[PDB]
């Protein structure tokens, strides 16, 4: 598909598409390719995710949904339509598209077609409305009513397939083919009128049923089982985690670029023991005025260094002019661009790309000369 490294690099249209709008990427591409000579294929090698992100934006489509139902006409009455809705109507209904392509534009304009379509009985039939003989409809669109009937039979065959015996209702009525009993009352049969023919309410029920079947089937596009379904999962053994445990041993070598005897500690401990019990003079803590100056002199030495560091700890204000600064930024950016591609193949570890390393080296040398 058009989401892999190979196809994305070779898709010229996509690369020009985002680059057309993407300004920051455009600035670097113009400098590092038009004049510097970096091959286009190498430039997009490190920007694969950028290409995929833009493609995915326009490479996805919404799911099927009932569109004619949403269309509510709401003396003058106005109904709002949008191109996205227009495409949805064609996708969810091929009869509308059939009468649209062969008519628009040959006889009249598109706006009249949709006004013609809505006023026609074809729109009512597709929307599920019960057709009323009183309604006049449109003469041109009504010509496709018979054609739509043929598609309905074709769609029924398209949806007709053998069904699993678990939920096969046909077999239940065919379990005994010689059942003879009282016919069900009229409440348990499709409605009929005085003349005896169908009232037509069954047709809309099939139409909505057909719409759902087509929508579900469209999902399964080109892009043992009963054993598990009937199993009682609640009675089976509870799921058990299979996480791996780890034990960390702590033993590392020491960092690499007179010992006091036991009695000495006791001897020294006694000295502090006596020096503490006998008396304690806090006033002796004051320096002698000869080391305080040295202590202060070295402490400030760090203060001055720290103060200089911290006084300069969005972009910082600069002294260079805008023209020179912009040129310097471009030179820094183009040199950095060459550095990345050079390291990818220089550190690739495959001798196949030796020529690229030599070629990438040349531009780096030119950067030194340019700098």
């Amino acid at each position: 598909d058009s989401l892999s490294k190979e196809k994305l690099l070779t898709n010229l249209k996509l690369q020009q598409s985002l680059l057309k709008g993407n300004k920051v990427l455009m600035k670097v591409f113009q400098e590092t390719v038009i004049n510097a000579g970096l091959p286009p294929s190498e430039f997009w090698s490190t920007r694969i995710p950028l290409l995929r992100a833009f493609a995915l934006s326009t490479s996805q489509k919404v799911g099927p949904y009932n569109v004619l139902s949403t269309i509510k006409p709401v003396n003058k009455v106005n109904v709002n339509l949008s191109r996205e809705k227009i495409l949805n109507i064609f996708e969810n209904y091929p009869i509308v598209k059939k009468a649209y392509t062969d008519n628009v534009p040959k006889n009249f304009k598109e706006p009249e077609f949709w006004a013609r379509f809505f006023s026609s009985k074809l729109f009512r039939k597709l929307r599920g409305e019960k057709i009323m003989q009183n309604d006049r409809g449109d003469v041109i669109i009504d010509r496709y009513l018979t054609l739509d009937q043929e598609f309905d039979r074709k769609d029924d065959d398209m949806l007709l397939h053998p069904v699993k015996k678990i939920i096969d209702l046909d077999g239940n009525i065919q379990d005994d083919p010689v059942v003879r009993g009282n016919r069900p009352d009229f409440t348990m049969q499709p409605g009929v009128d005085i003349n005896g023919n169908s009232d037509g309410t069954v047709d809309i029920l099939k139409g909505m049923n057909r719409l759902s079947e087509k929508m579900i089937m469209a999902l399964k596009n080109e892009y043992n089982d009963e054993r598990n379904e009937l199993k009682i999962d609640d009675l089976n053994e509870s799921y058990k985690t299979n996480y791996a445990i780890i034990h960390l041993k702590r033993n590392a070598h020491e960092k690499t670029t007179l010992k006091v005897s036991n009695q000495q500690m006791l001897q020294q401990l006694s000295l502090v023991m006596d020096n503490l019990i006998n008396k304690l003079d806090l006033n002796q803590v004051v320096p002698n005025n000869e080391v305080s100056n040295k202590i202060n002199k070295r402490v400030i030495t760090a203060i001055k260094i720290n103060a200089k560091q911290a006084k300069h700890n969005l972009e910082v204000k600069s002294t260079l002019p805008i023209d020179l600064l912009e040129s310097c930024r471009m030179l820094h950016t183009t040199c950095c661009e060459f550095l990345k591609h050079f390291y990818i193949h220089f550190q690739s570890g495959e001798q196949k790309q030796a020529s690229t390393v030599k070629k990438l080296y040349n531009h780096l040398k030119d950067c030194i000369e340019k700098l």
């Binding site: 010229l12 057309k20 455009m26 113009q30």
Partner: peptide, 21 residues
């Protein structure tokens, strides 16, 4: 200007198509 940068890109991409083709 962006328009000038677009034209040279179109000419450059046109050259790419001409070169690749």
């Amino acid at each position: 200007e962006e328009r000038e940068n677009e034209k040279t890109l179109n000419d450059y991409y046109a050259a790419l198509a001409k070169k690749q083709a």
